[PDB]
Amino acid sequence: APAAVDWRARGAVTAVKDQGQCGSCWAFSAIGNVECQWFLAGHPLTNLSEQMLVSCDKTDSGCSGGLMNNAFEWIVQENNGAVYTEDSYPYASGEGISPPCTTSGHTVGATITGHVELPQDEAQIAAWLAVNGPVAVAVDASSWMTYTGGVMTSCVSEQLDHGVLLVGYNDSAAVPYWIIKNSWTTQWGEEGYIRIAKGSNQCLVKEEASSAVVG
Ligand SMILES: */C(=C\S(=O)(=O)c1ccccc1)[C@H](CCc1ccccc1)NC(=O)[C@H](CCCONC(=N)N)NC(=O)N1CCN(C)CC1
């Protein structure tokens, strides 16, 4: 695989978001992934809707949590692959209350055909990411509350409790790391991102990695 890849530098990643006071991390992980996959299939980088999933995806639980692999299955099996634009279905759950699902008046921003569940293997995830783009991952982020910067090498790695987006890695650094996009505003971490060390299943990062497929 390449020594280092940063999809932000390649213009594949939209701005860091704020999930607010709502456990909608899984929707920000899954939508961030679809945004990147849609741009990498040759479309313009387009802002897509987490509210679609928080309100309409009833296989997940809204502000009380979900799975990115369920979100991708809902989009494909129940919504004919469609993911609406943010502008036409804006986020409304930042105080913890999701409006009811609305079907009409929203504009499709991207379409996906399926998703792939990647191996529980950091080297294979990195090689996949270098060729195919950012990857949604579940992590244990319980020890992330004090993180301000640097490469984390003591992440508590016990229970998957959060969903985030792998946007790159660097195997050349003194401590090899993953670059992760979080959804806790740009004030948190390194302008909204965290680096965790790569190769020791920090935060259980290898355990539930996946991506939407475009085309
Ligand atoms: C988002 C995490 S967060 O940003 O709120 C957070 C992370 C770490 C520390 C503090 C806060 C949500 C929070 C869901 C929530 C909200 C209120 C109370 C209880 C739970 N986390 C998830 O959506 C989480 C994502 C990881 C999925 O991992 N994969 C597997 N476990 N296979 N999923 C869940 O929390 N749920 C909850 C129960 N379900 C119905 C779905 C999965």
Q: What is the DSSP string of the chain?
A: --SEEETTTTT------B--SS--HHHHHHHHHHHHHHHHTTSPP--B-HHHHHHH-TTS-GGG---HHHHHHHHHHHSTTEEEBTTTS----TTS-PPPP--SS--EEEE--EEEEPPS-HHHHHHHHHHH--EEEEE--GGGTT--SSEES----S---EEEEEEEEESSSSS-EEEEE-SB-TTSTBTTEEEEESSS-GGGTTTTEEEEE--
Ligand 1 centroid–CA 162 distance in Å is 5
Q: How far apart are CA 127 and CA 170, in angstroms?
A: 12
Question: Nearest-5° angle of CA 17, CA 67, CA 61?
Answer: 85
- Cα(196)–Cα(79) distance, rounded to whole angstroms? 34
| Closest C-alpha among 142, 125, 143, 122 to residue 134 | 125
Q: How many CA atoms lie within 13 A of 190 on its CB side?
A: 12
Q: Tell me the C-alpha distance between 194 and 152, whole Å.
A: 8
Q: How far apart are CA 203 and CA 138, in angstroms?
A: 9
Contacts of 70 (CB under 8 A, 6+ apart): 26, 57, 59, 60
- Homologous superfamily of 1-215 in CATH? Cysteine proteinases (3.90.70.10)
Clarify whether 162 is annotated catalytic.
Answer: yes
Tell which residue, 73, 51, 8, 21, has the closest CA to residue 213: 73
- Is there an atom of ligand 1 within 6 Å of 207 CB? no
Ligand 1 center–CA 43 separation, angstroms: 31
How big is the chain, counted in residues? 215
The residue whose CB lies within 8 Å of the most ligand 1 atoms, and thus the one to mutate among 26, 31, 157, is 26
Resolution in A: 1.3
Give the closest residue (by CA) to ligand 1 atom 18. Answer: 64
Q: Is the dihedral of CA 32, 191, 201, 174 positive or negative?
A: positive
In whole angstroms, what is the distance from residue 148 CA to residue 126 CA?
24
Indicate if 69 belongs to the active site.
no
Q: Residue 142 is encoded by which pair of tokens?
A: 């319980």
Check: CB of residue 19 under 8 Å from CB of residue 183.
yes
**Is 25 in the active site?**
yes
Residues pairing with 171 in the sheet? none
Cα 1 to ligand 1 centre (Å)? 31
Nearest atom, ligand 1, residue 140 CA? 8
Rounded CA-CA distance 18/24 in Å is 10
User: Which residue type is seen at 58?
Assistant: K
* 59 ligand 1 Cβ < 6 A: no
| Cβ count within 10 A of residue 131 | 10
- CA–CA gap between residue 102 and residue 56 (Å, rounded): 8
For residue 27, the CA-to-ligand 1 centroid distance in Å is 10
